[PDB]
From Swiss-Prot:
Residues of the site described as Involved in the binding of some activators, including histamine and L-histidine: 89
Coiled coil: none
Residues bound to substrate: 195-196
EC number from the UniProt entry: 4.2.1.1, 4.2.1.69
GO cellular component assignments: apical part of cell; cytoplasm; cytosol; extracellular exosome; myelin sheath; plasma membrane
Effect the entry attributes to changing residue 59 to L: Reduced activity
Organism of origin: Homo sapiens
Phenotype for residue 64 to H: Enhanced proton transfer
Reactions performed catalytically: hydrogencarbonate + H(+) = CO2 + H2O; urea = cyanamide + H2O
Gene from which this protein is expressed: CA2
Record protein name field: Carbonic anhydrase 2
Quaternary assembly: Interacts with SLC4A4. Interaction with SLC4A7 regulates SLC4A7 transporter activity. Interacts with SLC26A6 isoform 4 (via C-terminus cytoplasmic domain).
Secretion signal span: none
Result for mutant: residue 139 to F/Y: Strongly impaired activity
């Protein structure tokens, strides 16, 4: 019964998921004055030309756009990564107000939302095995600010009415995740965790420096989703973000000077 409410939110998760207080928890604050350029880093390779989206699902915590991950169709490689990481899904975290919603922060700044493109390391065969490994996942995180509309997000926005409540899904084929990227692939990276229970410390985070802009109308439609199931009292799906966790014995590295 974890969530983001009044009595089940992030500050409670440790009782069921003690790794919530672990050594490598996410998100974190990215201090641009202490992150250090790492010349050993390579450019990201984002290879999404062959992506096969399938479905969009309201899981009661966010919505996931799911992909066919049974072949190397949409992969992330390079950067800090060794090997090939396959896209399984993306989802967002967002606020009730434009001044909060992101999970990572940058010099303590909160963005309106954050996109997570989740990938798993093909050496482990499937997602469920990958999450048991320290290098099992690679999550590309992208900040959202409110300003101009993001045209490539609109197809997501316009299906949201069909998945208003927890447990609803809809077909979502032929969606191109390249339309969600900023111009630059400059990034910060560090080792961390899933940001929802079970909070497993299996993630290489790659957080892009350049945010994307979305419109106030686009974010307002996200805020019409519901945490609840159909036929239950309405609870708007807002503020589904975990706050920054202690960095502990980690360093954040930058791909750029
Ligand atoms: Zn996430």
């Amino acid at each position: 019964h974890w969530g983001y409410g009044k009595h089940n939110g992030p500050e409670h998760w440790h009782k069921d998921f003690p790794i919530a207080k672990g050594e490598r928890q996410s998100p974190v604050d990215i201090d641009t004055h202490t992150a250090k350029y790492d010349p050993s880093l390579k450019p990201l390779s984002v290879s999404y030309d062959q992506a096969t989206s399938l479905r969009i699902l309201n899981n009661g915590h966010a919505f996931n756009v799911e992909f066919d991950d049974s072949q190397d169709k949409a992969v992330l490689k390079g950067g800090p990564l060794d090997g090939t990481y396959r896209l399984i899904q993306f989802h967002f975290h967002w606020g009730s107000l434009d001044g909060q919603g992101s999970e990572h922060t940058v010099d303590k700044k909160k963005y309106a939302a954050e996109l997570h493109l989740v990938h798993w390391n093909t050496k482990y065969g499937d997602f469920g095995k990958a999450v048991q490994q320290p290098d099992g996942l690679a999550v590309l995180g992208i900040f959202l600010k409110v300003g101009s509309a993001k045209p490539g997000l609109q197809k997501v926005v316009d299906v949201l009415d069909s998945i208003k409540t927890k447990g609803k899904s809809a077909d979502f084929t032929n969606f191109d995740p390249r339309g969600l990227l900023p111009e630059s692939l400059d990034y910060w990276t560090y080792p961390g965790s899933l940001t929802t229970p079970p909070l497993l410390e299996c993630v290489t985070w790659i957080v892009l420096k350049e945010p994307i802009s979305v419109s106030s109308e686009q974010v307002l439609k996200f805020r019409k989703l519901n945490f609840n199931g159909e036929g239950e009292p309405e609870e708007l799906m807002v503020d589904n973000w975990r706050p920054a966790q202690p960095l502990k014995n980690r360093q954040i590295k930058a791909s750029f000077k």
